[PDB]
Write a protein that binds this ligand. Structure first.
Ligand code: NAG
Lengths: 219, 417, 216, 145
């Protein structure tokens, strides 16, 4: 049993920049002959992990020449000469040879772009959903960068954390932006018991979160 | 399993000489300060033993006849020798005895093992702890019908490579006595460049294997090497270390076992090797004084067995009886007494001129080599359905009412179309 | 070209067993090792074990030791995986690798299989339209959304106008909560499109063969 | 065993070798099914004239006579003092006595002599010792080595 740690969790790099991903191991993996035992895996969106480098010093066949690794001891680093748009994914480190194989924590990569504030849009539950007995307040946060973002719900001025789910989209192929939505699960009685509903979008680019609200009686 | 090695190359069975190897304790009886004479399957001194070695483009794993027994001797540094495979066909067709040292303990099993082209054991990807513990089991694919199993004490086997001369010497004896297998072991350090050291050693029992199977061939297992850096095709791209092992043959010879004060054997004499050794065996002493002594008696063995029996002429007309113009009725069967002549049964039994032939009590072949006291012939003709009634302890219209054969009838029945 | 094929997804109740197959194509199963992996959204990748079809020896992660067994079929050139005494924690995506040739320099991965361990059964999705809220909120462009909740199992695809409208369309991956999946979609259009022009969201659930069209 | 082995007109589970190409050796079990050739004509592995199938079935029957009824036969073979004792009869053992003339029965070896601590060192596998005359010299106690 060997424990492996990775840092940083994620890092941005503009097209043509150099990306550095480091891995740490709790035990030495180098041996007498001098070679290193490790593999690098990259899992692109909608695709399974694929090998990039083996032995840290030799590139896997068919891989672009930009991918290359270096290091010694238990601390290594993966260097990419020129990062392209096809490098999106999660980087992993692998321990081979004859031993319970270990995996890394993962390292995500993204393309740098100008900061953009989120577009906050909030919609009330449909009449059909209320007839069915359920309710769900939906808030849309789109066209924001970086991915770091948060949403706060408030019912009649009171915060409610239960029933909140968020999902982050993959990097856009055209705008290179990120989109997220916040869904607040509420029963029919709970939804009809309150009128004012607010969705606050907290983003780094703006000190004051963008706030959108609606009234149940007005919808 | 069946993948052949890439670098393996066949070599002729070169031979080498041994000084005094082949000496072992016949049994558990203890003796000291005495010279004991015993006869058993032994490897003759100054005999020829196969010269085999294992390297990265010649890998030796041949099949050698077992006969009544064989002798083993090998010089090792990293203990490349893994074990052996014993059996008649070395396949699931019959039971095969196997001994494997897989870095934890000596394992002996007797089952129906599936034959492999190059059976062996090895290890892979050691990195920063040598380990060298069994990784793959290519010895056989499957086993069934296991009648015996044994386990020895645990131990760690050092397969790490070493430089310099050969620091280890292992010699085993394998033999079969009425199905009872006996294994003898010896382990001593040596400093050898090539071939074998010049000296004497005594082998001691290792395990008792009252299995009881016929073994006519055996194989020698070897341990290969693997690494993260230089692998190969599965499993043809694997290589083994440098080692040399030799295989001998045991013959029923008589040795003079010289026992010291502690009972260990310090010297041995092979009677059939040297006429001086013959004199020692006759005198039952390890020292021969100057003079002339009588050891045995020479004799010339016969070239071949020559048999000159008298003429077998004057044969009684058995052919006339079988081919007579007429035969008596079944109820009136004639009783013919035959004597004062010779009988040639080769032309009768082996001519295949009759539809059916059978004998009761004595096989037809044995009757040709026997001398009788009285011989009688009963000739009769019966229907086809009634032929089955001609036998001891039968009943029916013929067996009971016409002609009955006693239950102790030692004669034969002859019939044809 | 080497390719590894596995089942798209599997569903089993707690305490049952699931058998997975990893087909081998373009390479010899006997002469190359096989590996297995478990992936979770929070824990990333988790190693499971390895097997050699020629030998058959298997080593398992101390986490899963005694929890599963690995087998391979030489004639069919397919590697089989079996999991027993399944529970909720076993929900994850499984992958297989091989073609090592006793060397780390070559390995490949398949598309993987999504295995969910829960007592829930197939549930058709409930699609509802999401219209704009209070009129106090106005902008030069209007935003629309489609709500999908209470469906199982994944995947479920949501699009707009049968995929004919790709402008300002964002697809949000589903989120698992209380053994249920929930996803939403949003489309941004100018004020000259809605409500002047109809906007529809299409939701497809291949597992339940459910297709719903809702106009906003 | 007529009450058990006999079954109706015969029992095929019990068979015997009627013919063999030569004389059998002691403690030799031959299960070969090769056809016994009596004449000069090859049998071609099939039955025929001067060709008989060595394996045959008994005529065991419940009504057979004393001589024809089946009798189960068991033969016990053993080696005495030729190896370490693995079996022994239900004979109670007593305490050991030293420096006295006593009648000793060790591992099936019976004799009279004086038992004393021995200065000779036996090997781990060696159990029975012998003198120059080959008579009994020393032995190892089976219970406490
Ligand atoms: C060695 O052989 C024994 C025989 O049963 C087996 O149980 C064991 O797993 C093998 N390997 C080791 C390391 O003992």
């Amino acid at each position: 049993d060997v424990l492996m740690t990775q840092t940083p969790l994620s890092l941005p790099v503009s097209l043509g920049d150099q990306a550095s991903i480091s891995c740490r191991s709790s035990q030495s993996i180098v041996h007498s002959n001098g070679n290193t035992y490790l593999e690098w895996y990259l899992q692109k969106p909608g695709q399974s992990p694929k090998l990039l480098i083996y032995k840290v010093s030799n590139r896997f066949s068919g891989v672009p020449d930009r991918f290359s690794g270096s290091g010694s001891g238990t601390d290594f680093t993966l260097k990419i000469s020129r990062v392209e748009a096809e490098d999106l994914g999660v980087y992993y480190c692998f321990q081979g040879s004859h031993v319970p194989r270990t995996f890394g924590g993962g390292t995500k990569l993204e393309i740098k772009r100008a900061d953009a504030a989120p577009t906050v849009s909030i919609f009330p539950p449909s009449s059909e959903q209320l007839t069915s007995g359920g309710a769900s307040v939906v808030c849309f946060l789109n066209n924001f960068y970086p991915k770091d973002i948060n949403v706060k719900w408030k019912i009649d001025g009171s915060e409610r954390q239960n029933g909140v789910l968020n999902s982050w989209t993959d990097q856009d192929s055209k705008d290179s932006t990120y989109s997220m939505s916040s869904t607040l699960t509420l029963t029919k009685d709970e939804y009809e018991r309150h009128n004012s509903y607010t969705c606050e979008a907290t983003h780094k680019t703006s000190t004051s979160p963008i706030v959108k609200s609606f009234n149940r009686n007005e919808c | 399993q069946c993948v052949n090695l890439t670098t393996r190359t066949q070599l002729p069975p070169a031979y080498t000489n041994s000084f005094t190897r082949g000496v072992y304790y016949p049994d558990k009886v203890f003796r000291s300060s005495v010279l004991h004479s015993t006869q058993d399957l032994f490897l003759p001194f100054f005999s020829n033993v196969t010269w085999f070695h294992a390297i990265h483009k010649r890998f030796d794993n041949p099949v050698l006849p077992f006969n009544d027994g064989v002798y083993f001797a090998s010089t090792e540094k990293s203990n490349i020798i893994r074990g052996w495979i014993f059996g008649t066909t070395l396949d699931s067709k019959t039971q095969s005895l196997l001994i494997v040292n897989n870095a934890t303990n000596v394992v002996i099993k007797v089952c129906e093992f599936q034959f492999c082209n190059d059976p062996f054991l090895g290890v892979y990807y050691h990195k920063n702890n040598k380990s060298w513990m069994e990784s793959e089991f290519r010895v056989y694919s499957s086993a069934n019908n296991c009648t015996f199993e044994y386990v020895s004490q645990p131990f760690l086997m050092d397969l790490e490579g070493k430089q310099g001369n050969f620091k280890n010497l292992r010699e085993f004896v394998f033999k079969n006595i009425d199905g009872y297998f006996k294994i003898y072991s010896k382990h001593t350090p040596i400093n050898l460049v090539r071939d074998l050291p010049q000296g004497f050693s005594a082998l001691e029992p290792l395990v008792d294997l009252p299995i009881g199977i016929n073994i006519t061939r055996f194989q020698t297992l070897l341990a290969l090497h693997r690494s993260y850096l230089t692998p190969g095709d599965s499993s043809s791209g694997w290589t083994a270390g440098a080692a040399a092992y030799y295989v001998g043959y045991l013959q029923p010879r008589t040795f003079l076992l010289k026992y010291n004060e502690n009972g260990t054997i310090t010297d041995a004499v092979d009677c059939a090797l040297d006429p001086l050794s013959e004199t020692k065996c006759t005198l039952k002493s390890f020292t021969v004084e100057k003079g002339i002594y009588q050891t045995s008696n020479f004799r010339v063995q016969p070239t071949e067995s020559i048999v000159r029996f008298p003429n077998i002429t004057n044969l009684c007309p058995f052919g006339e009886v079988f081919n007579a113009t007429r035969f008596a009725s079944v109820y009136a069967w004639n009783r013919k007494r035959i004597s004062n002549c010779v009988a040639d049964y080769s032309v009768l039994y082996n001519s295949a001129s009759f539809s059916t032939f059978k004998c009761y009590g004595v096989s037809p072949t044995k009757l040709n080599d026997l001398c009788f006291t009285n011989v009688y012939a009963d000739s009769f003709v019966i229907r086809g359905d009634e032929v089955r009634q001609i036998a001891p302890g039968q009943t029916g219209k013929i067996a009971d009412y016409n002609y009955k054969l006693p239950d102790d009838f030692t004669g034969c029945v002859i019939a044809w179309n | 070209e080497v390719q590894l094929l596995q089942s798209g997804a599997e569903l089993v109740r707690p305490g049952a067993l699931v058998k997975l197959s990893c087909k081998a194509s373009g390479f010899n199963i006997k002469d190359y090792y096989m590996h297995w992996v478990k992936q979770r959204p929070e824990q990333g990748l988790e190693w499971f074990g390895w097997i050699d079809p020629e030998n058959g020896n298997t080593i398992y992660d101390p986490k899963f030791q005694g929890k599963a067994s690995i087998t391979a079929d030489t004639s069919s050139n397919t590697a089989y995986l079996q999991l027993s005494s399944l529970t909720s924690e076993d929900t994850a995506v499984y992958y297989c690798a091989g073609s090592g040739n006793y060397e780390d320099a070559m390995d490949y991965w398949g598309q993987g299989t999504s295995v969910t361990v829960s007592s829930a059964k197939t549930t058709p999705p409930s699609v509802y339209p999401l219209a704009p809220g209070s009129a106090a909120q106005t902008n030069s462009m209007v935003t629309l959304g489609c709500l999908v909740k209470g469906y199982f199992p994944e995947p479920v695809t949501v699009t707009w106008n049968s995929g004919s409208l790709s402008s300002g369309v964002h697809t949000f991956p589903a989120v698992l909560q209380s053994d249920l999946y929930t996803l939403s979609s949003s489309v941004t259009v100018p004020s000259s499109t809605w409500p002047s022009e109809t906007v529809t969201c299409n939701v497809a659930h291949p597992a339940s063969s459910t297709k719903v069209d809702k106009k906003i | 065993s007529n009450n058990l082995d006999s079954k109706v007109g015969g029992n095929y589970n019990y068979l015997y070798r009627l013919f063999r190409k030569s004389n059998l050796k002691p403690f030799e079990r031959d299960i070969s099914t090769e056809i016994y050739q009596a004449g000069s004509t090859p049998c071609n592995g099939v039955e025929g004239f001067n060709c008989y199938f060595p394996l045959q079935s008994y005529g065991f029957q419940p009504t057979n006579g004393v001589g024809y009824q089946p009798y189960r036969v068991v033969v016990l073979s053993f080696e005495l003092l030729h190896a370490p004792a693995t079996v022994c009869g239900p004979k109670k053992s007593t305490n050991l006595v030293k420096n006295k003339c006593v009648n000793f029965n060790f591992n099936g070896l019976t004799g009279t002599g004086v038992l004393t601590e021995s200065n000779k060192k036996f090997l781990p596998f060696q159990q029975f010792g012998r003198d120059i005359a080959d008579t009994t010299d020393a032995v190892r106690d089976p219970q406490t080595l």
